[PDB]
């Protein structure tokens, strides 16, 4: 039962290379059951030739696996694709000593192959261990539009997933292109101060040039690239300070195969007595069928337990990766590269002496480039935010209070002077409420510099399903949020599950719930006149509320809303003269206002208790640098009697 | 604590103790099993199944609920601050001084300051 | 220039009598110029020397495949082999209709076939036409798995319905020796519709497994993607009754259908490009020298071959190489063995021609439920005003005529219903009665609900239904949940 193997090779040294060391390596066993063998053929131009003369190959033994390696030849990607499509066809294993390019590791297309170097996707690997080294978390991903781009692109995604935080606007640029100043000066406006690129190295010289044209190069900032980006002529346009890597014992090979031989013979004599191996499949024309036993033997090599190569401990992922390959990270220190990193699996060991950044600053530069002009949205709300016309002298009522003291307001532009029906008349408008003595504090907390504008929407915003249907996407208001209309939100909101996915909220700095509003009484919701509605009474809320997806959540009172959906003002404390004209009865809404209400009109009466607990407080935009701060300014307040005085103030003498 | 959190021996006669209770080590070779129940308790038994966790209960020995002396934590907040702990639940307020050394959830039960006198 | 090839086949007479002479098809606005070339049984050396020695040698100006027991990998050697020498082939056959999603940079591959997700599509339009609402899957991980655990939930996951998804579940199996752990496995599971992805002998095996568990039942219904069951024409065994697989417009589908399909499509491709400012295209050089490294503005003519359209069937292509927006068809296993047409999604919305499912076949599931709408316990409403799933918490029902329009039913014993299939794991159906509301025993005849399960037309009956001794003595009953009485309703 003689076992042969074969492998292909290139520079015909290496060949006799192979065979010394296939030879040497049979002295592992000799004890005449089981002996070994090999066959070597070089490469050719030509591919369909050349696949040809691996038919030639496949003829002349019952090979049993091919190896493959890649010439000097600079053609890339069209190296290794003949020999893998031909031996599919009968199952028979092939191992590519050195093949970085993402397609292959695609098991459905290239059905048997083996890999013992890792893909370009594993490197992204590295770099997310890296960003938790230095506690970075708003990412910048540039990358091209080849397959290996959405490959990288897919794996990070998943990976961030996993702790899933965030990615922040990926964008794609068309390969081998000139001028892509575009997409870089479009992204240059985010806070983000971390890029990571890998494309082809003339687009890394490209983007490196159009960089350095547009000053993205400069201080503070800092951006890492891949594996190709730092070789080849991408060296002539590069700047100090980026960060990269490379493997270990790459592009030898050599050594390489003392690994893969060391495998299949650890292959070899651990198959032959399975149950019933007793061939591998003879012949290269007319037997058109395939190997009865390719799956089992390419099964068992692929969780081959190797215990020692030349390259450290090697095994396989589930679809053939490397597996705890090791990588060198080097420094662009003054055109130069030193190894300053070693990972391996786990973490990336700064034994090192010194990291210098793009920006010759020595100490650890953070991202986050911190703004300095928000922008700030509110809405119209009857006790918290006070709207009015200005005065044609430039500005409106500068005078004391019912204390003396100078009630502190500013100017919102906003809204288009009429809700229902006008074009637009975006105006000035002088705006002053508690919202706005406690904003003030916190910029005077905070160094900050506010310019407040209103909502064109007059909603707060829910999810809505838009008749071209597609995911729903925020409205009005959130929607400014999100969109980056707005980078702040400082209003009476509600804090809800159904917003806490996008938005990061403040700790609650008032606690309200719903209550009803009747002029006369009334009872909480047990009535059978609210169990079945009525035609006298006429129950109502607001659209587009918080109220309105409370009640389209609700298996048992599903049927409110279809009272509810019926007749609501689209409205706001307009709809409040609903109750004065006698026609709207109930009004459920928030607590706070709709008694402050109470107390400061007439006529007006609250029914029992309430019959739900929330708050409000500030949301940003997730993970905003800033939370942590304004949360802790906001309790420091509440400490300080802060929000009683202002309470007090505003709602309490009434 | 308050009914919040509620302590108890196990029932001797059928050697632990009912269901619808968490054990619980009064640990400070010192381990002698009593089981808890309350409304934090049912909290974090309800609260555990959604996440998905697993998880143990043993009570705080020195301090009741954690203040700085000559620059030292203890309590709550100094089990929690020197990694011998994950979290701490129960009668937990929220103020300044803890909420810069140790991250804080959103409330789910307000309170204050408040004054009882006779009737 | 427009050339055949064949890779196996029955009598091989027929294709070259219905083929040869360029009489066939000489309808489209080109002079077909057709050449032949075969081939016995393919191997990778054979096919590549055979077909670029014709191409170096004719001079073609295209060729088109017709294929064979449907091997797993013949599709890469022909990309493969267009890359490299450059020409725009076409093949619409078994084997060779499976799609490629990573396509290579300069290949002209353009196969006759639609993707999984446009496949998943149509097959959960035609859930949601039943509105059976609660599926798992179950894969195993055959070649190219992956692909459809992201199609699913990116198919399910968006969508103006609830898709209440159960599970998932991934199988592995040898079936000769290591399927010990998979009936374990297989029988664990409990859900009310499956659906399937694997091989024809992997379905075999699978199938025999399941039907060795148990959960085969007439309350379980199978879907499975075209991948699977390719052997149209000849009803394998072991194959449980009423499954759905959806396959594109082949019932006119032969040879001789393909034939005439391919020359005429390319042949019009050719001239379309002409029809404004062009001219005849030549062959590209040989499978030897590897010319062509640049794109020159011929490729533009490949771009010519997207838009195209003959014979009412639309043909519109896709980016990738198969086309869009396709019509087809949706099919199912009969009583008697053999494929029956069954609905189609004629570029609208899912089309039937049995608006009931049959459940054609004992310790069996999916019990008929008969009732009567009262006024309080159990109301019927119209549909839903244009979608036809009535309103959520509804249930559907179904009035007889022994037009069978479908109505919502809703109330106290629809609900009461719903908890005790939910807490005893049993499914049914809404059914209603035509013979008198209640139903008497005049004339010694039982009409009605009480008639109606008694005939055993009706294995249950639900609502408004007294006792009393007169019904007692042939039909069973169970403990009284509502106490009733007789009273007397007066005025003020
Ligand atoms: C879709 O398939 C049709 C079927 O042949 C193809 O028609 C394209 O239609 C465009 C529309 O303008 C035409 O482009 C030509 O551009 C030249 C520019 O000077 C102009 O002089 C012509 O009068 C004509 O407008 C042309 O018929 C054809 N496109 C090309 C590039 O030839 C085409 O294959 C597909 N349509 C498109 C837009 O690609
Ligand atoms: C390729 O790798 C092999 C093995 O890692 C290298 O050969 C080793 O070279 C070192 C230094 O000269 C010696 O100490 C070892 O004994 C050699 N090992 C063997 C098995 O010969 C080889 O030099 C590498 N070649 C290149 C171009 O990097
Ligand atoms: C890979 O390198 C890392 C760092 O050089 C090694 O990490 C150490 O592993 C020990 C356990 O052997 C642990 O105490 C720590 O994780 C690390 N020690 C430290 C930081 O002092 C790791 O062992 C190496 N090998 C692998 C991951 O297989
Ligand atoms: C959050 O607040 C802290 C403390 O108020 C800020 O840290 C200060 O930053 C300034 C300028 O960078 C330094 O002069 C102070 O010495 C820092 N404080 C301490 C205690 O070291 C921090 O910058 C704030 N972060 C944000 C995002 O607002
Ligand atoms: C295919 C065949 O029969 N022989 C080949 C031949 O090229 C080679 O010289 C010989 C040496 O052992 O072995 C092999
Ligand atoms: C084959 C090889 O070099 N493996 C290296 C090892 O030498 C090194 O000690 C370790 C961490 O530095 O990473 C790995
Ligand atoms: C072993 O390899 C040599 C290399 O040329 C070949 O000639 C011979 O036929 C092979 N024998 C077996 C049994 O594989
Ligand atoms: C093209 O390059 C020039 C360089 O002078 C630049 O000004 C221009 O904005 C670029 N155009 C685009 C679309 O990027």
Request: hydrophobic share 40%; proline share 6%; aromatic share 8%.
């Amino acid at each position: 039962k003689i076992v042969n193997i074969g492998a292909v090779l290139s520079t015909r040294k290496h060949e006799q290379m192979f065979r010394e060391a296939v030879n040497q390596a049979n002295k592992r066993h000799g004890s005449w059951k089981i002996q070994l063998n090999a066959t070597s053929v070089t490469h050719k131009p030509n591919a369909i030739q050349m696949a040809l003369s691996v038919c030639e190959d496949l003829i002349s033994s019952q090979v049993y696996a091919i190896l493959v390696s890649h010439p000097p030849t600079p053609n890339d990607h069209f190296t290794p694709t003949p020999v893998s499509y031909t031996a599919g066809f009968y199952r028979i294993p092939v191992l590519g000593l050195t093949t970085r390019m993402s397609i292959y590791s695609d098991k459905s297309i290239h059905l048997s192959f083996l890999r013992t170097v890792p893909p370009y996707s594993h490197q992204s690997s590295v770099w997310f261990e890296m960003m938790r080294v230095y506690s970075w978390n708003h990412i910048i991903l540039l990358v091209s539009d080849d397959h290996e781009g959405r490959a990288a692109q897919k794996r990070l995604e998943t990976l961030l997933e996993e702790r899933e935080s965030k990615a922040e606007k990926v964008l794609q640029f068309d390969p081998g292109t000139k001028n892509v100043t575009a997409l870089l000066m479009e992204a240059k406006e985010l806070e983000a101060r971390v890029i990571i690129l890998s494309a082809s190295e003339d687009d890394a010289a490209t983007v490196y040039r159009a960089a350095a044209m547009l000053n993205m190069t400069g201080s503070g900032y800092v951006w890492l690239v891949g594996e190709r980006e730092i070789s080849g002529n991408a060296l002539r346009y590069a700047p100090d300070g980026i960060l990269g890597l490379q493997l270990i014992n790459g592009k030898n090979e050599s050594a390489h195969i003392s690994d893969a031989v060391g495998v299949v013979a650890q292959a070899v004599h651990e198959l032959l007595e399975k149950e019933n191996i007793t061939d591998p499949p003879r012949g290269c024309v007319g037997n058109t069928n395939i190997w009865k036993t390719g799956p089992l033997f390419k099964r068992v090599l692929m969780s081959s337990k190797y215990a020692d190569g030349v390259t450290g401990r090697v095994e396989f992922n589930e679809d053939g990766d490397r597996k705890f390959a090791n990588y060198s990270i080097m420094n662009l220190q003054n055109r130069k590269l030193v190894q300053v990193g070693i990972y391996n699996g786990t973490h990336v060991i700064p034994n090192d002496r010194k990291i210098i950044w793009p920006g010759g600053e020595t100490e650890k530069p953070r991202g986050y480039q911190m703004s300095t002009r928000l922008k700030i949205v509110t809405i119209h709300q009857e006790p918290f935010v006070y709207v009015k016309p200005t005065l044609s002298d430039g500005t409106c009522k500068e005078e004391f209070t019912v204390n003396g003291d100078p009630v502190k307001k500013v100017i919102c532009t906003g809204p288009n002077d009429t809700s229902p029906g006008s074009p637009r008349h975006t105006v000035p408008q002088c705006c002053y409420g508690f919202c706005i003595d406690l904003l003030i504090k916190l910029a005077r907390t905070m160094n900050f510099t506010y310019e407040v504008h209103l909502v064109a929407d007059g909603k707060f915003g829910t999810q809505e399903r838009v008749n071209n249907s597609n995911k729903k996407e925020w409205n009005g208001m959130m929607g400014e949020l999100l969109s980056g209309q707005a980078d702040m939100i400082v209003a009476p909101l509600t804090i809800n599950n159904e917003r806490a996915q996008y938005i990061e909220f403040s700790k609650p700095f008032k606690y309200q719930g719903l209550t009803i509003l009747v002029k006369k009484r009334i009872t909480g919701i047990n009535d059978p006149r609210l169990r079945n509605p009525s035609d006298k009474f006429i129950y109502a809320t607001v659209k587009q509320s918080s109220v309105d997806i409370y009640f389209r959540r609700q298996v048992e009172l599903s049927t409110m809303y279809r009272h509810m959906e019926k007749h609501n003002y689209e409205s706001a404390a307009e709809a409040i003269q609903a109750v004065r004209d006698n026609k709207l009865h109930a009004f459920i809404w928030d607590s706070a206002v709709l008694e402050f209400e109470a107390s400061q009109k007439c006529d007006l009466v609250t029914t029992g208790e309430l019959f739900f607990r929330s708050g409000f407080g500030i949301g940003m935009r997730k993970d905003s640098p800033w939370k942590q701060n304004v949360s802790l300014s906001i309790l420091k307040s509440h400490e300080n009697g802060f929000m009683e005085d202002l309470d007090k103030t505003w709602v309490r003498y009434q | 604590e308050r009914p919040f959190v509620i302590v108890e021996s196990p029932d001797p006669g059928t050697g632990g103790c009912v269901p619808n209770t968490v054990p619980c080590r009064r640990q400070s070779a010192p381990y002698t099993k009593l089981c808890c129940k309350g409304f934090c308790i049912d909290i974090l038994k309800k609260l555990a199944r959604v996440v998905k966790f697993s998880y143990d209960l043993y009570l705080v020995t020195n301090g009741k609920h954690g203040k700085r002396v000559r620059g030292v934590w203890n309590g709550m907040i100094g089990e929690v601050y020197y990694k011998r702990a994950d979290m701490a639940i129960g009668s937990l307020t929220i103020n300044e001084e803890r909420s810069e050394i140790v991250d804080f959830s959103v409330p789910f039960v307000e309170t204050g300051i408040s004054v009882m006198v006779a009737r | 220039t427009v050339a055949v090839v064949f890779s196996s086949s029955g009598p091989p007479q027929a294709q070259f009598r219905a083929r040869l002479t360029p009489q066939s098809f000489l309808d489209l606005p080109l002079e077909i110029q057709p050449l032949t070339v075969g081939v016995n049984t393919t191997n990778p050396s054979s096919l590549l020397t055979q077909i670029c020695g014709l191409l170096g040698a004719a001079h073609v100006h295209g060729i088109v495949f017709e294929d064979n027991v449907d091997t797993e990998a013949v599709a890469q050697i022909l990309d493969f082999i267009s890359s490299q020498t450059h020409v725009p082939i076409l093949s619409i056959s078994g084997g060779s209709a499976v799609v490629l999603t990573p396509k290579e940079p300069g290949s002209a591959f353009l196969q006759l076939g639609v993707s999984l997700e446009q496949q998943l599509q149509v097959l959960f339009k035609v859930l949601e036409e039943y509105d059976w609402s609660a599926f798992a899957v179950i894969t195993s991980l055959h070649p190219g798995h992956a692909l459809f655990l992201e199609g699913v939930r990116a198919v399910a996951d968006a969508s103006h319905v609830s898709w209440r998804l159960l599970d998932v579940v991934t199988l592995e199996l040898g079936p000769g020796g290591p399927r010990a752990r998979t009936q374990r496995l297989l029988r664990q599971l409990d859900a009310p519709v499956f659906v399937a992805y694997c091989s024809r002998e992997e379905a075999e095996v699978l199938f025999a497994e399941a039907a060795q568990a148990g959960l085969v039942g007439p309350g379980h219904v199978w879907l499975v993607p075209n991948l699977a069951l390719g052997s149209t024409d000849a009803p394998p065994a072991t194959f449980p009754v009423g499954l759905i697989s959806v396959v594109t417009e082949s019932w006119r589908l032969s040879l001789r259908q393909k034939v005439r399909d391919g020359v005429a499509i390319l042949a019009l491709g050719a001239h379309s490009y002409w029809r404004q400012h062009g001219t005849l295209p030549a062959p590209a050089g040989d499978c030897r020298v590897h010319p062509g490294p640049v794109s020159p503005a011929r490729e533009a003519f490949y771009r010519h071959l997207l838009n195209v359209t003959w014979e009412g069937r639309d043909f519109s292509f896709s980016p990738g190489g198969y086309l869009v927006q396709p019509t087809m068809v949706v099919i199912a296993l009969n009583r008697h063995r053999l494929w029956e047409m069954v609905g189609r999604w004629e570029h609208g919305v899912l089309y039937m021609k049995y608006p009931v499912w049959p459940r054609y076949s004992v310790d069996s599931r999916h019990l008929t439920v008969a009732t009567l709408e009262e006024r309080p316990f159990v109301i019927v409403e119209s549909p839903d005003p244009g979608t036809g799933g009535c309103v959520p918490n509804t249930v559907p029902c179904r009035r007889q005529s022994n037009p069978y329009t479908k109505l919502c039913c809703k109330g106290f014993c629809i609900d009461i219903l719903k908890k005790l299939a939910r807490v005893v794991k049993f499914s049914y159906d809404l059914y209603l009665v035509t013979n008198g509301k209640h139903g008497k025993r005049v004339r010694g005849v039982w009409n009605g609900m009480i008639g109606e399960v008694y005939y055993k037309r009706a294995d249950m009956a639900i609502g408004s239904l007294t006792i009393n001794e007169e019904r007692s003595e042939i039909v069973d009953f169970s403990v009284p949940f509502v106490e009733t009485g007789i009273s007397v309703m007066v005025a003020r």
